[PDB]
């Protein structure tokens, strides 16, 4: 469906005027919803963990990739709604959030790149999908060319992504030179015992992981996330993380790797410690993303990581979307718009939000306490599954470090709630304006999922036991 959407959309966006952008985006939003609901029944193919190799052994289809695919569609639906609908109908918000003409096509193509990364069974397909996603994401960074910071960001991103892509291509070709093969499926226990592939496979893993910004190469990505338009940051900080991490989890090429162990430790420490002194909202959220990417990196050191990883990535996607949407909503109550790409920038600008919108702060509290991992919110069960996995496999020191990093990051998670439940002198008296029904309903759905997902935990594990065993 995705290819058909891309083709049609190119035709229409060519033949439509600049005023039709939001209507087009609503059209695609509904189309993706329709695909998600009508084609969901293809799950049935994956009963008993049945795996399918497709396209001449280039693509691999199993329950895991089907789930990642559905999750990516859900994320795309939510993200496209933010562009397809106005928060408010005033002039200010027409200036604040207007979709570019080609933005939707870039979004769909980057989604296609991500899905091809997930399904990749062969290194040529992996490299082509990586380059497709990398190019589309460069352009998404750069499409808002009136922003000085966005253009500077796109250029830095181009160069860092190019270097990491060259590292990846080098790793692929060294694997070819040693094994005369482009598939990991050719690998076996005998082959891993016989030959020392550790260097090559770790170089490939590192080349992929530095593209989502794990320490000690974080800062360039945090700067890019800071300097992009806020509705762009909601996307570019999420989809590449999902695709790359899912590919690495599915491939399992760094089991018990000492280098990945040390880098995951370092990423946890830097993500937790470095986010403490932050005063800008989006830099705080980017360091949050770094710490959570560390939590997921830990899962690359062990076999049978499917359940913990899927649960964690789903709850993280929901929490991330929700926190960005809350920051977006809280824009209507700020008294100073900093600029047209990033209306709110400093955490202190939320001060006293509870007096303007009590339930917005309720939602904020719920999402923050999910991030900290307070039961019975989803975040707690995500961390619980991760701890179960790593302790089952004897990563004791890493478990201690994970404890410590969650503690430390709770400080700058609660910074947001702290300033949000403080008091502001000028308190909204009244307003005729209504927030858009659709986005408020979506934000509410995310909040209710985070709050009451745990009631379905046992049902989920029962389903999982029949589709992934």
């Amino acid at each position: 469906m995705l290819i058909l959407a891309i083709i049609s959309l190119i035709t229409f966006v060519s033949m439509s005027k600049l005023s039709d952008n939001r209507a087009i985006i609503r059209l695609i939003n509904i189309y993706l919803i329709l695909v998600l609901v009508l084609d969901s029944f293809l799950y049935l193919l994956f009963l008993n963990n049945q795996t399918y190799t497709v396209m001449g052994e280039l693509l691999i289809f199993n329950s895991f990739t089907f789930y990642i695919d559905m999750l990516i569609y859900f994320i795309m639906i939510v993200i496209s709604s933010l562009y397809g609908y106005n928060l408010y109908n005033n002039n200010l918000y027409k200036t604040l959030f207007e979709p570019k003409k080609e933005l939707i096509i870039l979004f769909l193509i980057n989604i296609l790149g991500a899905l091809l990364i997930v399904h990749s069974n062969d290194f040529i397909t992996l490299f082509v999908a990586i380059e497709l996603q990398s190019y589309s994401i460069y352009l998404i960074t750069a499409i808002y060319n009136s922003s000085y910071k966005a253009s500077k960001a796109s250029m830095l991103y181009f160069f860092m992504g190019g270097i990491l892509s060259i590292l990846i291509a080098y790793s692929i070709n060294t694997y070819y030179s040693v094994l005369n093969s482009y598939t990991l499926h050719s690998l076996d226990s005998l082959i891993i015992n016989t030959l020392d592939l550790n260097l090559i496979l770790i170089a490939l893993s590192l080349g992929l992981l530095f593209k989502i910004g794990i320490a000690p190469l974080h800062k360039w990505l945090i700067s890019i996330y800071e300097n992009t338009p806020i509705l762009i940051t909601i996307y570019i900080s999420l989809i590449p993380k999902i695709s790359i991490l899912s590919y690495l989890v599915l491939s399992n090429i760094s089991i018990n790797s000492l280098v990945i162990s040390i880098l995951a430790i370092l990423t946890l420490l830097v993500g937790s410690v470095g986010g403490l002194l932050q005063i800008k909202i989006k830099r705080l959220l980017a360091f949050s993303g770094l710490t959570n990417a560390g939590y997921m990196m830990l899962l690359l050191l062990l076999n049978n990581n499917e359940f913990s990883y899927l649960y964690y990535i789903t709850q993280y996607s929901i929490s991330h979307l929700a926190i960005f949407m809350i920051i977006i909503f809280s824009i209507y109550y700020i008294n100073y718009i900093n600029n047209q790409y990033n209306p709110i920038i400093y955490v202190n600008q939320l001060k006293g939000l509870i007096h303007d919108n009590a339930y917005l702060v309720l939602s904020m509290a719920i999402v923050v306490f999910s991030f900290i991992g307070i039961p019975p919110l989803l975040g707690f069960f995500g961390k619980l599954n991760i701890l179960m996995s790593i302790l089952n496999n004897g990563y004791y020191f890493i478990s201690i470090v994970l404890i410590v990093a969650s503690l430390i990051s709770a400080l700058y998670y609660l910074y947001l709630l702290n300033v949000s439940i403080q008091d502001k002198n000028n308190i909204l008296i009244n307003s005729n304006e209504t927030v858009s029904s659709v986005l408020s309903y979506i934000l509410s759905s995310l909040i209710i999922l985070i709050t009451f997902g745990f009631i379905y935990n046992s049902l989920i594990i029962d389903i999982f036991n029949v589709y992934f065993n």
């Binding site: 290194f123 040529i124 082509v128 460069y138 352009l139 060319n145 000085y148 796109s154 250029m155 060259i166």
Partner: protein, 86 residues
């Protein structure tokens, strides 16, 4: 393996220790891709295998589109500032 490796490493060091210009940066990217491809093609020949050359062709095409997009990004960056002081 020798010419490609040295082009890769020298272009990488040119990229990293660039403190002269951004064009040097573009060029180091392109030449790195060159060296990768030369290593690949020598291996293809030594194995009498077509997969190496197929991936070489794909690299060629992707380096083309990457150059196109990168130069477009540079132009859009220039449009706002009028000058590249590197």
């Amino acid at each position: 393996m020798f010419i490609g490796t040295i082009i890769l490493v020298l272009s990488f060091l040119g990229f990293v220790f660039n403190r002269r210009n951004i064009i040097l940066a573009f060029i180091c990217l392109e030449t790195m891709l060159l060296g990768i491809n030369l290593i690949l093609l020598r291996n293809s020949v030594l194995f009498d295998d077509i997969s190496g050359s197929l991936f070489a062709i794909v690299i060629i095409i992707l380096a083309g589109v990457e150059s196109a997009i990168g130069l477009s990004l540079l132009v859009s960056y220039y449009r706002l500032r009028g000058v590249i002081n590197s």
